Amino acid sequence: GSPGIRLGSSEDNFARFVCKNNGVLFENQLLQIGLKSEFRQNLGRMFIFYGNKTSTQFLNFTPTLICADDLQTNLNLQTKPVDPTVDGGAQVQQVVNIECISDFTEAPVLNIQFRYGGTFQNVSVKLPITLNKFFQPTEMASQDFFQRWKQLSNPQQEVQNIFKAKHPMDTEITKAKIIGFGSALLEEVDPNPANFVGAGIIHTKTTQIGCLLRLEPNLQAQMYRLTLRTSKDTVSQRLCELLSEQF
Prior knowledge:
It comes from Mus musculus (Mouse). Belongs to the adaptor complexes large subunit family. 32% of the residues are buried. The chain has 4 helices and 14 strands. Helix content is 15%, strand content 43%. The chain folds into 2 domains: 1-134, Sandwich (Immunoglobulin-like), CATH 2.60.40.1230; 135-243, TATA-Binding Protein.
């Protein structure tokens, strides 16, 4: 990724929004940007809240969405303009309508420009619209899970990652993280009681991708082995990257 200290960067808090949909995405001494998102099928609706932390009204308040050319073909974002004048202490809301066309890895960038005290202010932050947001959890019996797991033939469709735990192995937190990620969390499927098994379908306009995941904790080494088996190589890769950063 991008080298150097990531503090005051465009992605300081991006990671906290992969498994949850609400929270403060960015905050400086003048503005606070909060989010509330909801997804269904291959669609999403993200409410962006711009809070004026001062006692002075902002002018020319202009939020613009910026997506790489490649991203634009896989993700369609639409929004209505917000009023350019924001009173001090006020919070204005912007709604972004999202339509996932095909699977994607990049993230849109929200750029906000405004005038405060006669000065030009500029902020750019990555919006947490990630592939997993388009998940439909799919509950299924142990037998059905194993039958599907064993239907994978393409080696590219399986992605494994063995990594060090960033957080304590708190069972309940882990279960909550997996459910927040988007897939169904299947209870009592893997013969080893320490492992977590998940299943879901990633929805896009052009294709529906069945996904299976297995998370195996190594308590002594404080490491995890995450395996993704999906019907599309690029989805297995993206989902494995995203989920690995959460434990």
